[PDB]
Design a protein around this ligand. Structure first.
Ligand SMILES: Cc1cc2nc3c(=O)[nH]c(=O)nc-3n(C[C@H](O)[C@H](O)[C@H](O)COP(=O)(O)OP(=O)(O)OC[C@H]3O[C@@H](n4cnc5c(N)ncnc54)[C@H](O)[C@@H]3O)c2cc1C
Ligand SMILES: Cc1cc2nc3c(=O)[nH]c(=O)nc-3n(C[C@H](O)[C@H](O)[C@H](O)COP(=O)(O)OP(=O)(O)OC[C@H]3O[C@@H](n4cnc5c(N)ncnc54)[C@H](O)[C@@H]3O)c2cc1C
Ligand SMILES: [Cl-]
Ligand SMILES: [Cl-]
Lengths: 417, 410
């Protein structure tokens, strides 16, 4: 599976999107340069959830063992009432998720980044301290803040929620905007939890726990043997750990204990964007991936999934390029394959903002009832207990989708050019 | 309360008998229970009590007592025999409380005592009273001593080897080991402690055999091992030998068993009728729908049987209505119990598959919680049908729709 025509591909951004794109495109014969503005690389000190649609790909790419060594395999997702901790919903993870062909893991962002870096490294010329400030959309070329011109055949903006390349693609200022929500992000020692009989079960029976309250919710889960991840969503108004404790003072007693263990916290503002009208610059030499085109509320835990899926689709499509005339149509095929899914996913995250943050009242009572009975789509419910939603999200195979597309459509539409 | 107060003879003081005595007594009928044993009580074993049952116990005012002694399991977990690999999960806990009452694990004796407390003020219990013959016309039950006991109606709650069933009908390969082990021994082993600390119904499935196990009290873990009966206190040695191929955690659990009850399981096709044609004798519980215990609903069906009898017989005002009421009882109960017996049969097959295509397909169905060859308790429809059922509501619905005008015409 190699491309007849080898491109020089410029990837702006060395987050997880960038890494995965460098691996996926490099391994099919393309030359890859990654231009990163920061003078270091790595992920922040926090947990991430990786669903089967992602871990299917990690397994396929030969890093399943590394994932398995560091990551935690939760048994279930448990939703609880803020004041008491009363369980109002369960969605089975574990073998219920493995039925889609790979596990549902909880992992430290740094461990995941390091694993992706191990795949990308031989495929990418990484340039750090390289801030793209302009683009020649015709050639194309990426122009650094120093004035250095970097020539290639194609530019991928994997440059995140403050993407410059999004601005290039749309030909004007354009941004993800604040949502009115922020999170505190914290890791605490599992050792402190194991020492308390009420908190030990949260370590010894790994689950994704969600406490839902008026305008606020907490998600918490083990991410390494020594570390438990906590994320607290709350109204953004503009003693960091102190203000967090204060903001969640009405949550149940076990929550108060967990928060008493937090020494410090990242404050993080949550951005969101309406879906873009296009991911392709009209001249057909620049496109986007990851948060640069589908930044979403994190309440569906699929943003990195979508970035990595985006990369996997690019890899499959661009293994088939044999002529420069096919480049622009391939970018539109990428957009066609990815825009609807990512937009739906952004949508489900927005639905969960509402569901998770309901004030006490009729809606909240109905939500809790739906969650107890695991209501099926055949202030709403537990998406992860819905078999159809699970099939659509977690049963998806990015590589298979793009190959199916090539066979059915791409071959006859692009394949002769 | 009933306009016409009957004298009702109940043969058997197992759980069916007790529930019938309570349900019939409280609506005005006089009740005599004839039990052949000179004591009453239950065997040393666990039972699972589903929402269809615990809804009724709650309604009858013993919910707090039940809650005090019961364990509330989180889930039901099915595992492969060789490895212990989890191949299926069905959520219990709040998933089951969505049907209006909890799914409990409880010691048979604790449940029996609670039923006894309900029935006791309503019944005259006669122990050492073995019914050996019946006058189906009068009717009367005649004891082994020759004493004749008169009443208006006889209910056979006299178990799997019911004599009254033989009266009513007018004509003449699996076993389990049952054990309890101390939770202390499990708590002491880091591999086994989770089974105590996270209460589940665990089922290990293998060729021709399966094990079910669950906590029933603070100190006690219930274990039941189904296996081919080649045809009673059993040998714990033979049990261990029969399950020597099961996963190492199971070997540990069985190494803790000091003794075992050996118990033969009988499965019966549904009866053609539960009413003697003269309309003075009927059946309840294992006396009419003894099933393989693989669906954990035998006592549920007996208690439901009783609850429907109570509702129907609150309405009797004339002796002419008695026979039609027994047929109404049968009409309301026979199809559900037969379906239930059927689900237990289907589980025999599912649980006992040899390794092969079927077993692989079963495991796939169980992982994904297919909505047979799967985990019935993870199926929403089957759950609604079995556990969402309210015996008293069904019978009142029936009264409103049909019974008032149909039994009104006697
Ligand atoms: C609280 C929270 C929880 C989340 N939980 C989950 C979850 O459980 N599961 C999940 O799948 N996703 C999750 N996500 C989403 C996930 O974090 C992101 O979608 C993903 O990390 C985005 O990766 P990316 O590579 O597109 O962007 P980024 O990680 O933003 O990387 C972009 C990179 O581009 C560089 N760059 C920017 N501009 C320039 C420029 N002009 N020149 C050069 N380089 C530039 C940046 O410096 C950065 O290194 C979560 C997000 C949040 C905030
Ligand atoms: C291994 C196993 C596990 C089970 N697990 C479950 C479970 O999880 N959930 C569930 O709901 N059910 C379960 N069951 C089923 C349940 O135990 C039975 O369905 C129920 O106990 C039957 O009650 P009964 O009162 O109809 O009959 P029995 O309990 O058999 O009582 C009949 C009584 O009548 C007496 N008697 C008999 N003949 C006469 C006579 N001629 N005169 C007077 N008295 C007489 C007997 O001595 C006895 O006392 C299980 C059964 C088994 C074997
Ligand atoms: Cl996300
Ligand atoms: Cl049973």
């Amino acid at each position: 599976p190699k491309a007849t025509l080898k491109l020089h591909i410029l990837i702006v951004g060395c987050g997880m999107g960038g890494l995965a794109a460098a691996y996926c495109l490099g391994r099919v014969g393309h030359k890859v340069t990654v231009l990163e503005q920061a003078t270091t690389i790595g992920e922040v000190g926090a947990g991430i959830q990786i669903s089967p649609n992602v871990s299917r790909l990690l397994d396929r790419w030969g890093v399943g063992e590394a994932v398995r060594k560091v990551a935690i395999r939760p048994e279930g997702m448990v939703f609880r009432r803020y004041t008491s901790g009363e369980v109002v919903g369960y969605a089975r993870l574990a073998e219920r998720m493995e039925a889609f062909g790979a596990p549902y893991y909880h992992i430290h962002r740094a461990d995941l980044f390091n694993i992706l870096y191990s795949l990308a490294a031989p495929y990418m010329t990484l340039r750090l301290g390289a801030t793209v400030v302009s683009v020649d959309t015709e050639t194309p070329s990426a122009i650094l803040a120093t004035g250095e011109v970097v020539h290639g055949d194609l530019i991928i903006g994997a440059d995140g929620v403050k993407s410059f390349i999004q601005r290039v693609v749309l030909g004007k200022p354009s941004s993800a905007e604040p949502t009115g929500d922020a999170v505190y992000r914290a890791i605490i020692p599992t050792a402190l939890m194991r020492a308390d009989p009420e908190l030990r079960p949260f370590v010894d029976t790994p689950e994704m726990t969600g406490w839902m309250g008026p305008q606020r919710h907490i998600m918490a889960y083990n991410i390494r043997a020594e570390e438990y991840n906590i994320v607290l969503a709350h109204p953004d108004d503009g003693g960091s750990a102190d203000k967090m404790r204060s903001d969640f003072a009405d949550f149940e007693p076990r929550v108060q204990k967990l928060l008493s263990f937090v020494k410090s916290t990242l404050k993080w503002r949550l951005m969101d964007r309406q879906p873009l009208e296009t991911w392709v610059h009209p001249a057909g030499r620049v496109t986007l991936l990851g948060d640069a085109c589908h930044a979403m509320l994190p309440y569906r835990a699929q943003g990195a999934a979508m970035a990595i899926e985006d990369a996997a689709v690019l890899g499959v499509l661009f293994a088939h390029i044999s002529d420069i005339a096919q480049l622009k149509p391939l970018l539109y095929a990428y957009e066609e394959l990815r825009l609807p899914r990512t937009a739906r996913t952004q949508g489900d995250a927005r639905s969960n903002q509402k569901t998770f943050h309901l004030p006490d009242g009729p809606s909240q009572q109905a939500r809790d009832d739906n969650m107890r009975k695991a209501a099926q789509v055949v202030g709403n419910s537990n998406q992860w207990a819905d078999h159809q939603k699970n099939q659509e999200q977690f049963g998806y195979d990015a590589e298979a989708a793009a190959e199916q597309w090539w066979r059915d459509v791409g071959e006859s539409r692009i394949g002769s050019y």
